[PDB]
Every structure is written in structure tokens, then in C-alpha cells.
Paper text:
TEAD1-4 are essential transcription factors and key downstream effectors in the Hippo pathway. There are four [name] members in humans, TEAD1 (TEF-1/NTEF), [name] (TEF-4/ETF), TEAD3 (TEF-5/ETFR-1), and TEAD4 (TEF-3/ETFR-2/FR-19) that share high structural similarity and a conserved palmitoylation pocket. Even though TEADs are mostly chromatin-bound in cells, they do not exhibit any transcriptional activity on their own and rely on their coactivators to turn on gene expression. Conversely, the two main Hippo pathway transcription effectors, YAP (*YAP1*) and TAZ (*WWTR1*), control gene expression via interacting with TEADs at their C-terminal transactivating domains.
To date, multiple efforts to target the Hippo pathway in cancers have mostly focused on small molecules binding to the palmitoylation pocket of [name], which can subsequently block the interaction between YAP/TAZ and TEADs. Compound A binds the same site as Compound B in a very similar manner and the only modifications to Compound B were made to include a handle to attach an E3 Ligase ligand. To facilitate structure-based design of potent [name] degraders, we solved the co-crystal structure of compound A bound to [name] ([Fig fig5]). As expected, based on previous reports and our biochemical data, this compound strongly binds all the [name] isoforms via the lipid pocket in a [name] lipid HTRF assay. Compound A makes hydrogen bonds to the backbone amides of Cys380 and Glu381, but binding appears to be driven primarily by van der Waals interactions deep in the pocket as well as with the benzyl group, which is sandwiched between Cys380 (which would otherwise be lipid-modified) and Lys357 ([Fig fig5]). This moiety provides an optimal vector for the terminal amide to exit the pocket, allowing for conjugation of an E3 ligase ligand via a linker in our [name]-CIDEs ([Fig fig5] and S5E). Reversible [name] lipid pocket ligands, compound A and compound B, both bind pan-[name] but show no inherent cellular activity in the [name] dependent OVCAR8 cell line ([Fig fig7]). No [name] degradation was observed upon treatment with a [name] lipid pocket binder (compound A or compound B) indicating that both [name] and CRBN engagement are required for CIDE-mediated [name] degradation ([Fig fig6] and S6B). We attempted to obtain co-crystal structures of [name], CRBN, and either of the compounds but were unsuccessful, likely owing to the highly flexible nature of the PEG linkers in our compounds.
Numbering used by the authors: 217 to 257, 264 to 308, 325 to 446
């Protein structure tokens, strides 16, 4: 009954995340394709964290050791169906909270469980309508993922894409920079959506 209904905690909720591409045409007439997209403008299903330990690093900065530090209720699994049917490649995250903090946002890209690239932004808060807003908008997508996307896109069969994406994950950890306590940890596993449907997501709580 205290279990989350969306991707967030009482201390920090995710408002919106999107990874996208804007073609060069967008200047003449703006358009943008969304690979994956969560919008959050009944309890959530659950998943046993151990079942995914192997899909992420297993030493310092790994899922097993992060979950043991807790708090447990901060851990979610996002299952994406990516829309690979479609420039500037970018990503945008927006969070909210009732407390003024300075967040440190780490995004680990992982292949066969081994960290491959990592990014660590830092977002100070901006109070707006009584609640603090954290905006990491239009951040450039990392060069590894943009290449991955163009390579992934050319595989002749969708089941080959999903074969590759079985071994590709991303891990995000948002922590209070000043106190080191963790606020929200999201694990992302990927599938490619069929050509006819657009991106969708299924969010789960990570339990033990
Ligand atoms: C600044 N340039 C650098 O090189 C430094 C750097 C390193 C790592 C990550 C970033 C930016 N962060 C994302 O790019 C990012 C990307 C994603 C997801 C990207 C796509 C990748 C393709 C897949 C698909 F192939 F499955 F379609 C769909 C998701 C994400 O997700 C939480 C979270 N973050 C930047």
C-alpha cells in the first residue's frame, strides 16, 4: 500500500524521460522521433533484483552492492520497447521533489553486464510552484549509443536486434550529492518494437 505507482519515490519522482533524434529537416519544420519515452505528467508489478544482478556490474557501483545500501523502495526496472523505425541524438530527464537537493545523475551503459561507458551529470534544483524541479534537457546522447543505434538499425531481422539487445542494458543512479544517500535507481532492459507500433514501457519495482 506504500508501494510505488510510478517511477519515483516520495523524495524524488521522475516526470519525463526521452531518448530521441531530430533530423536536419527539423529546422525547416520541426519533428522528432522518440526511441524510448516515459511520461508521468494501482501498485506496480515487481521483479526480484537478484534475477538481474548478472546484467550489471557486480563490484563497486554494481546492482547487488547498491541495493544492499538501499533504500530498497528506490529501485525500479524499466522494460522498453524501442521504436527503431524512422541528425541530433539527445536525451532528456526531468525530476521533481519536495526538498531542495543537488542531484548527481549517473548513466551506466553496459554490455554483457560489463560497464562500457558512463556519464555523471549534476543538477541543482530550481524551485517552481512550491516544488523543486530538476531539468537535464536536451543532453547529447553518448557516441557509443548513437553508433549502436545505427548498427542496430541495419540488422535484417527483428529477432536479431532482440538477440543483441538481450545483452545491452543501461543503469541510472540518482543520488543526493551532498549526503551521498541514493534517491532513485533505474535499470533499463530493451526490446525493439514491431515496425507498426511506437515506443512503450513497462515499469516494475525491484524487490528481494
Ligand atoms: C555526452 N557524450 C558522451 O559520450 C558521454 C555520455 C555517456 C553515457 C551516456 C550519455 C548520455 N545518456 C544517454 O545517452 C542515455 C541513453 C539512453 C537510452 C538510449 C537509447 C539507446 C538505443 C536503445 C535501443 F537501441 F534499444 F533502441 C534505446 C535507448 C538512456 O536510457 C535510460 C539513458 N541515457 C553521455
Amino acid at each position: 500500500a506504500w508501494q510505488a505507482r510510478g517511477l519515483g519515490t516520495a523524495r524524488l519522482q521522475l516526470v519525463e524521460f526521452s531518448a530521441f533524434v531530430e533530423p536536419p529537416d527539423a529546422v525547416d519544420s520541426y519533428q522528432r522521433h522518440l526511441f524510448v519515452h516515459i511520461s508521468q505528467h494501482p501498485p506496480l508489478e515487481s521483479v526480484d533484483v537478484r534475477q538481474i544482478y548478472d546484467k550489471f556490474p557486480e563490484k563497486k557501483g554494481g546492482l547487488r552492492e547498491l541495493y544492499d545500501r538501499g533504500p530498497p523502495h528506490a529501485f525500479f526496472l524499466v522494460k522498453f520497447w524501442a521504436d527503431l523505425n524512422w541528425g541530433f541524438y539527445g536525451v532528456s530527464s526531468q525530476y521533481e521533489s519536495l526538498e531542495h537537493m543537488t542531484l548527481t545523475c549517473s548513466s551506466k551503459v553496459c554490455s554483457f553486464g560489463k560497464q562500457v561507458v558512463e556519464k555523471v551529470e549534476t543538477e541543482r534544483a530550481q524551485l517552481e510552484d512550491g516544488r523543486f524541479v530538476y531539468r537535464l534537457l536536451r543532453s547529447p546522447m553518448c557516441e557509443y549509443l548513437v553508433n549502436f543505434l545505427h548498427k542496430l538499425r541495419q540488422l535484417p531481422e527483428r529477432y536479431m536486434m532482440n538477440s543483441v539487445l538481450e545483452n545491452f542494458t543501461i543503469l541510472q543512479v540518482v543520488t543526493n550529492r551532498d549526503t551521498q544517500e541514493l534517491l532513485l535507481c533505474t535499470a533499463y532492459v530493451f526490446e525493439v518494437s514491431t515496425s507498426e507500433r511506437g515506443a512503450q514501457h513497462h515499469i516494475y519495482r525491484l524487490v528481494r
